[PDB]
Design a protein around this ligand. Structure first.
Ligand SMILES: *[C@@H]1O[C@H](CO)[C@@H](O[C@@H]2O[C@H](CO)[C@@H](O[C@@H]3O[C@H](CO)[C@@H](O)[C@H](O)[C@@H]3O)[C@H](O)[C@H]2NC(C)=O)[C@H](O)[C@H]1NC(C)=O
Ligand SMILES: *[C@@H]1O[C@H](CO)[C@@H](O[C@@H]2O[C@H](CO)[C@@H](O[C@@H]3O[C@H](CO)[C@@H](O)[C@H](O)[C@@H]3O)[C@H](O)[C@H]2NC(C)=O)[C@H](O)[C@H]1NC(C)=O
Ligand SMILES: *[C@@H]1O[C@H](CO)[C@@H](O[C@@H]2O[C@H](CO)[C@@H](O)[C@H](O)[C@H]2NC(C)=O)[C@H](O)[C@H]1NC(C)=O
Ligand SMILES: *[C@@H]1O[C@H](CO)[C@@H](O[C@@H]2O[C@H](CO)[C@@H](O)[C@H](O)[C@H]2NC(C)=O)[C@H](O)[C@H]1NC(C)=O
Ligand SMILES: *[C@@H]1O[C@H](CO)[C@@H](O[C@@H]2O[C@H](CO)[C@@H](O)[C@H](O)[C@H]2NC(C)=O)[C@H](O)[C@H]1NC(C)=O
Ligand SMILES: *[C@@H]1O[C@H](CO)[C@@H](O[C@@H]2O[C@H](CO)[C@@H](O)[C@H](O)[C@H]2NC(C)=O)[C@H](O)[C@H]1NC(C)=O
Ligand SMILES: *[C@@H]1O[C@H](CO[C@@H]2O[C@@H](C)[C@@H](O)[C@@H](O)[C@@H]2O)[C@@H](O)[C@H](O)[C@H]1NC(C)=O
Ligand code: NAG
Lengths: 109, 241, 237, 48, 119, 76, 48, 48
C-alpha cells in the first residue's frame, strides 16, 4: 500500500496539450490524500507545480494545469518549445507521511 | 516606564500592570508626540487631571496599524474575540501610536504573536496563556499538527515596507475605576489650607461639594473613611492630611 | 464533625460610617445557622469565600496556604505567623504535601476566639474576641487587609488543634448600626418568612397583622414544539 | 439610566456637549417622581 | 526575499556522525512548518521528516529513532542531526518550507542543497 | 390531531405572612394567595392555601383578617 | 416607540448591546400606564 | 434540512469521472465549457 509511479516518459509538440498520470496503491486518489506536483531542473532545482490535488502553486504559470483528471492524480501542460525540458514528480499524503513520485522526463521536439 | 518601555509583550499575553499610590500627570501625556488615537470613554480627556481614582490598570500590547478599531467596548473582530475583551460600560482611555521606527525590522519581525483560534470569545480581560494544540479539524488531533489540525498561535511578520495600515501600533489601555475606596491615584492638583465654620466649596479626594465644615464629635473607627446619612448623603469626612 | 454558626460572620461590607440606622446590603455573607465543617488538616476547597475560626491557646494555628494546585506549577499565596512578624507572600512556591521561587510580593506587619473571612482582589477581615462549639454571640468583623494581587484561587489548606470552616453565599442582610456606628445586630433576609417580613418592613419588630412579602410563581418544566403532519416529501428520488 | 446619580460627578467627569444626555435622564426621572409625590399629596389633602 | 539556506561540510567517512543546518529568511517558523527531503545520486527524492510549527517533531517511520532534528525560533535556524552514517546514506539533503496554514497547503520552498558523500 | 387545547397561565400569586407581633411570639403562618395547595397543617380557603395554622371548629371575633370570612389569631 | 411590543421578540431579534434602548422605551410606557391606572383608582376610591 | 428555498432546480447529466471532476464549481474542462455549465457563485450541491 505504498507504490508510487509515473510514466517517466513525456514528449509533447508545441500547441497540443498532454496529460501525465501518477497512480497510487489505493486506486482512485481522493483530495483527502493531498496531491502535489513538483518540477526538477537538470541543475537540481525544485519548484512546486500543483497542490491540494487541484490547486496550482503560487508563482507557477497558469499554463501548468493539474487536476484529478483521471481516477488517479494527473497533470496537464500546454506544449512549450523551451522551458518544459524538466523532470516532474507526483506526491501523495498518506495518513502518516509523504510519498514522492518517480519522475517523468519531458523532451519537447 | 510603561510608555517608554522597549520590550512589549504578546497580545494574547498582553501585559497588565497596576498603578496606584502615586501622583499622576495626564495632561503632559495628552500633549502628545502624535499618538494615533488618544480616545477616551466615560471621561473627558481634558478633565483627567482632576479626578481621583482608586487604581488605574494599564494594559500593554503591540498590534497591527489599522486593527486598533477593534479596541472598543461594543466591538467585534478576531482581536476582540480571542485576544482582548473590553467590557461594556468600560471607563478608561485607549492610547495607540505607530511604532514602525522601533518594532518593525527589515524582512519582517516574526516574534510578535497573535492568536486566531479558540473555542469561544474571551471573557472581559481573559488571558488564554495556554498554548494547547487546537483541534481545528472535526477529528481530534491529540498532538497532531496535520493539514486540518492547526496551532492556535500565529506570528505577524512586521516589515517596514508593509502597508501603513499594517505597521506596528503600540497600544496601551488605561482602565479606571471611579469608585469610592481610598482614591490613591490622583492628578497634580495642589493642596490648600482648611477653613471651618463658613459656607465653602470643598474637594476632599475628588469628593466635591459645597457646605459648612465643623469639628465633629463622631466616633469613627480607624478603618472608616467618611460618613453617610439616613438617606445616603455624605455627612462627615476624614481629612486626608 | 459538623456545627452550626448561630449568629456569626458579619463584616463591615464597605468603608462608610453610619449611626442608629437600619441599612440593607447584599453581598457574600455566611448564612445564619448554616453548616460549618469542624476539623481537627486536609486541603479544603475555596468555594466563593471562607469563614474561618479557631480557638487556640499556644497559637497552634499559624497560617494559611491558598492556591489552585499548591505546587510550583501555578501561583499560590502564603500567610504565615512567626514571633518575628507576619509574612504574606505570593510566589510559585514548592509546597510540601505535609506543610510544617519567582516571588512577586511580600508584606510584613479556651478563651481566645479568632474569626476570619477570606474573600475575593483578595480581601481579609478578622476579629479577636475573648471566649469561654461556636458561641451564640454577635461580633462584627472589621476589615484588616486588601491584597491587590488578583491571583486565581480554588483551594486552601491551614498551616498548623480545632478550627471551623464555612463558606459564603450571596445573601442580603439587614444591618443595625448603633450610635458608635458598630453593627449590633443583623437579620438574614432569606432564612425564614419572619425574617423576610422584617426585611420588607425595614425594621426589627413586626406588629401583629398580615403582611405581603414576595411572589410565588411556578416555573416551567420542558419545551414543547409541534408542527403540521409531515408528508408530501419532495420527489428527489 | 444615567451613569451616576451624583449630578456633580456627571458634571465633573463628562464634557458639556455629551453630558446633557445623562443630565436629561436624571431630570426626567426626578421630575416624574416629584409629580407623583404632589399628586399623592393632593388626594390625601382632600381626605383630610 | 523569501529564501532557504542550508550549510554543512558534508564530506563524511562511514560510521561517524555529521549534522546539517537550514537557515531561513523572509518567514517565521511560527507561520510555517519545515520538512526535509533527500536526493541520492541519480535516485528519486524521499521524505525524511517534518518539524511542526509550534513544537512537536515527526520522523520517517522506517527511519531510525537514533537521530534528532532541532530548530531555533528566535534566530531562525534549523539543525538536522545524524549520529551514525553508512555508505547508503550518501545523498544530497534539502530543507524545505511547508505552509499548512496557507491555501497552498503543500511545501512552498526548498533548500539550496548540500552534497554529502561517503569517503 | 384535530384536538383543542386550553391554555391556562401558570400559577402565580402573593405570599402573605401572618404574624402575631414579635412581642408575643416568633411563630408564623403563611398564606399563598389564589393557588390550590398541592402546588406549594395545610388548609384550603377561598383566599388560597394557609400553611402553619390550625383550623378550629368554633368561631371567635376577628383578629387578623384573611378573606371570605376567615380570620387568624394567636391562642393556646 | 419600540420596534415591537413582544419583549421576547425584541430580545431575540435585536442586538443585546442596543436592545436596552427598546426595553427602556417599553418600560417607560408601561410604567406610565400603570401609574395612570393607580391614580384613577385612587380618585374613584375616594368617591366610593 | 432547516432552511427553505423558493424553488428547487435539478440538473441531470451523464458524465465521466474526469467530467465529474470537471463538473465542479469553477472547474475547467470541455464538459464544463460546453456539455454542462453553471454560475460559479451560485450555491449548488452535486450528488454523483
Ligand atoms: C519562574 O522561574 C523559573 C525558574 O526559577 C523560570 O522559568 C524558566 O524560564 C522560562 C520562563 O521565563 C522558560 O524557559 C523557556 O523555555 C522555552 C523552551 O522550552 C523558550 O521559550 C525559552 O528558551 C525559555 O528559556 C521556563 O519556564 C524555564 N526555563 C527552563 C526550564 O529552562 C522563569 O524565571 C519563571 N517562569 C516560569 C514559567 O518558569
Ligand atoms: C483557576 O483555576 C481553576 C482550577 O484549576 C481553573 O478553572 C477550571 O479548573 C477545572 C478544574 O478545576 C478545569 O476544567 C476541568 O478540569 C477537570 C480536570 O479533571 C476536568 O473535569 C475537565 O477537563 C474540565 O475541563 C480547568 O482547569 C478550568 N476550566 C475552565 C477554565 O473552564 C483555571 O486554572 C482557573 N480558572 C479561571 C481563571 O477562571
Ligand atoms: C504630606 O502629607 C503627609 C500625609 O501623611 C503628611 O504626613 C503626616 O500625615 C499625618 C496623617 O495622620 C499627620 O500626622 C500630619 O499631617 C503629617 N505629619 C508629619 C510629621 O509629617 C506630611 O506632613 C505632608 N507634608 C508636609 C510638608 O506637611
Ligand atoms: C459607645 O462607646 C462609648 C465609649 O466607647 C460607650 O458609651 C459610654 O458609656 C459610658 C457610661 O456612662 C460613658 O463613658 C458615656 O456615657 C458613653 N460615651 C463615652 C464616649 O464614654 C459605649 O461603648 C457606646 N455607647 C452607648 C452604647 O451608648
Ligand atoms: C384543589 O385541589 C384539587 C386537585 O388538587 C382541585 O382540582 C379539582 O377541582 C374540581 C372543581 O373544583 C373538583 O371537582 C375536583 O374534585 C378537584 N380534584 C380533586 C379534588 O382531585 C380543586 O380545584 C381544589 N380542591 C378543593 C378546593 O377542594
Ligand atoms: C372540627 O374540625 C374538623 C375539621 O378540622 C371538622 O370537620 C370534619 O367533620 C366530620 C364530621 O362527621 C368529621 O368526621 C371529620 O373528621 C372532620 N374533619 C377532620 C379533618 O377531622 C369537624 O366538624 C370538627 N371535628 C370534630 C367535632 O371532631
Ligand atoms: C412588648 O412587650 C414587652 C413586655 O412583654 C410582656 O410580656 C409578654 C409575655 C407579652 O404578654 C407582652 O404582650 C407583654 O407586653 C413590653 O415592652 C410591652 O408591654 C410591649 N410593647 C413594647 C412597645 O415594648
Ligand atoms: C448540618 O449538616 C447536617 C448534614 O449532615 C444537617 O442534617 C444539619 O441540619 C445541618 N445543620 C443545621 C443547623 O441545619
Amino acid at each position: 500500500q505504498a507504490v508510487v509511479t509515473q510514466e517517466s516518459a513525456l514528449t509533447t509538440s508545441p500547441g497540443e496539450t498532454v496529460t501525465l498520470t501518477c497512480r497510487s496503491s489505493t486506486g482512485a486518489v481522493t483530495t483527502s490524500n493531498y496531491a502535489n506536483w513538483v518540477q526538477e531542473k537538470p541543475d537540481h532545482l525544485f519548484t512546486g507545480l500543483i497542490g491540494g490535488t487541484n490547486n496550482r502553486a503560487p508563482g507557477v504559470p497558469a499554463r501548468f494545469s493539474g487536476s484529478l483528471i483521471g481516477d488517479k492524480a494527473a497533470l496537464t501542460i500546454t506544449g512549450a518549445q523551451t522551458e518544459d525540458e524538466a523532470i516532474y514528480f507526483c506526491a501523495l499524503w498518506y495518513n502518516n507521511h509523504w510519498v514522492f513520485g518517480g519522475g517523468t522526463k519531458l523532451t519537447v521536439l | 516606564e510603561v510608555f517608554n518601555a522597549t520590550r512589549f509583550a504578546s497580545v494574547y499575553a498582553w501585559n497588565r500592570k497596576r498603578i496606584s499610590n502615586c501622583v499622576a500627570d495626564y495632561s503632559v501625556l495628552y500633549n502628545s508626540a502624535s499618538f494615533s488615537t488618544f480616545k477616551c470613554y466615560g471621561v473627558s480627556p481634558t478633565k483627567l487631571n482632576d479626578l481621583c481614582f482608586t487604581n488605574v490598570y494599564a494594559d500593554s500590547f503591540v498590534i497591527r496599524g489599522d486593527e486598533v478599531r477593534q479596541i472598543a467596548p461594543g466591538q467585534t473582530g478576531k482581536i476582540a474575540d480571542y485576544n482582548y475583551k473590553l467590557p461594556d460600560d468600560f471607563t478608561g482611555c485607549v492610547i495607540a501610536w505607530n511604532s514602525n521606527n522601533l518594532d518593525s525590522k527589515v524582512g519582517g519581525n516574526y516574534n510578535y504573536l497573535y492568536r486566531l483560534f479558540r473555542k469561544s470569545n474571551l471573557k472581559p480581560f481573559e488571558r488564554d496563556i495556554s498554548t494547547e494544540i487546537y483541534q481545528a479539524g472535526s477529528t481530534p488531533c491529540n498532538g497532531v499538527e496535520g493539514f486540518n489540525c492547526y496551532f492556535p498561535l500565529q506570528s505577524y511578520g512586521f516589515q517596514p515596507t508593509n502597508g501603513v495600515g499594517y505597521q506596528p501600533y503600540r497600544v496601551v489601555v488605561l482602565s479606571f475605576e471611579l469608585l469610592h475606596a481610598p482614591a490613591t491615584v490622583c492628578g497634580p492638583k495642589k493642596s490648600t489650607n482648611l477653613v471651618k465654620n463658613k459656607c465653602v466649596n470643598f474637594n476632599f479626594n475628588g469628593l466635591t461639594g459645597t457646605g459648612v465644615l465643623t469639628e465633629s464629635n463622631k466616633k469613627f473607627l480607624p478603618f472608616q473613611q467618611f460618613g453617610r446619612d439616613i438617606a445616603d448623603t455624605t455627612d462627615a469626612v476624614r481629612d486626608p492630611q | 464533625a459538623y456545627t452550626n454558626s448561630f449568629t456569626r460572620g458579619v463584616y463591615y461590607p464597605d468603608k462608610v460610617f453610619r449611626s442608629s440606622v437600619l441599612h440593607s446590603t447584599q453581598d457574600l455573607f455566611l448564612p445564619f445557622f448554616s453548616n460549618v465543617t469542624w476539623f481537627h488538616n486536609p486541603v479544603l476547597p475555596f468555594n466563593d469565600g471562607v469563614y474561618f475560626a479557631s480557638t487556640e491557646k499556644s497559637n497552634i494555628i499559624r497560617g494559611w496556604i491558598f492556591g489552585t494546585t499548591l505546587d510550583s506549577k501555578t501561583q499560590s499565596l502564603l500567610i504565615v505567623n512567626n514571633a518575628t512578624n507576619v509574612v504574606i507572600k505570593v510566589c510559585e512556591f514548592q509546597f510540601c504535601n505535609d506543610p510544617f521561587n519567582n516571588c512577586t510580593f511580600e508584606y510584613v506587619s479556651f478563651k481566645n476566639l479568632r474569626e476570619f473571612v477570606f474573600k475575593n482582589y483578595f480581601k481579609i477581615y478578622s476579629k479577636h474576641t475573648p471566649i469561654n462549639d461556636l458561641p451564640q454571640g454577635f461580633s462584627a468583623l472589621e476589615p484588616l487587609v486588601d491584597l491587590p494581587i488578583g491571583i486565581n484561587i480554588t483551594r486552601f489548606q491551614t498551616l498548623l488543634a480545632a478550627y471551623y470552616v464555612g463558606y459564603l453565599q450571596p445573601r442580603t442582610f439587614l444591618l443595625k448600626y448603633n450610635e458608635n456606628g458598630t453593627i449590633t445586630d443583623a437579620v438574614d433576609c432569606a432564612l425564614d418568612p419572619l425574617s423576610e417580613t422584617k426585611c420588607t418592613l425595614k425594621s426589627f419588630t413586626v406588629e401583629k397583622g398580615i403582611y405581603q412579602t414576595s411572589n410565588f410563581r411556578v416555573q416551567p418544566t420542558e419545551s414543547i414544539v409541534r408542527f403540521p403532519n409531515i408528508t408530501n416529501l419532495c420527489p428527489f428520488g | 439610566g444615567a451613569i451616576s446619580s451624583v449630578l456633580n460627578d456627571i458634571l465633573s467627569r463628562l464634557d458639556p456637549p455629551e453630558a446633557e444626555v445623562q443630565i436629561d435622564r436624571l431630570i426626567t426621572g426626578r421630575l416624574q417622581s416629584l409629580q407623583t409625590y404632589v399628586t399623592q399629596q393632593l388626594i390625601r389633602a382632600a381626605e383630610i | 526575499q523569501v529564501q532557504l539556506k542550508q550549510s554543512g561540510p558534508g564530506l563524511v567517512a562511514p560510521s561517524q556522525s555529521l549534522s546539517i543546518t537550514c537557515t531561513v529568511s523572509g518567514f517565521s517558523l511560527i507561520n510555517y512548518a519545515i520538512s526535509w527531503v533527500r536526493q541520492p545520486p541519480g535516485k528519486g527524492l524521499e521524505w525524511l521528516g517534518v518539524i511542526w510549527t509550534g513544537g512537536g517533531t515527526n520522523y520517517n517511520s522506517a527511519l531510525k529513532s537514533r537521530l534528532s532534528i532541532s530548530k531555533d525560533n528566535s534566530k531562525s535556524q534549523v539543525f538536522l542531526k545524524m549520529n551514525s552514517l553508512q555508505t547508503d546514506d550518501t545523498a544530497r539533503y534539502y530543507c524545505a518550507r511547508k505552509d499548512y496554514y496557507g491555501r497552498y497547503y503543500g511545501m512552498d520552498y526548498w533548500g539550496q542543497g548540500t552534497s554529502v558523500t561517503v569517503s | 390531531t384535530l384536538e383543542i387545547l386550553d391554555i391556562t397561565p401558570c400559577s402565580f400569586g402573593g405570599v402573605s405572612v401572618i404574624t402575631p407581633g414579635t412581642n408575643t411570639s416568633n411563630q408564623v403562618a403563611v398564606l399563598y394567595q389564589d393557588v390550590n395547595c398541592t402546588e406549594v397543617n395545610v388548609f384550603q380557603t377561598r383566599a388560597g392555601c394557609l400553611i402553619g395554622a390550625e383550623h378550629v371548629n368554633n368561631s371567635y371575633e376577628c383578629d387578623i383578617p384573611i378573606g371570605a370570612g376567615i380570620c387568624a389569631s394567636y391562642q393556646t
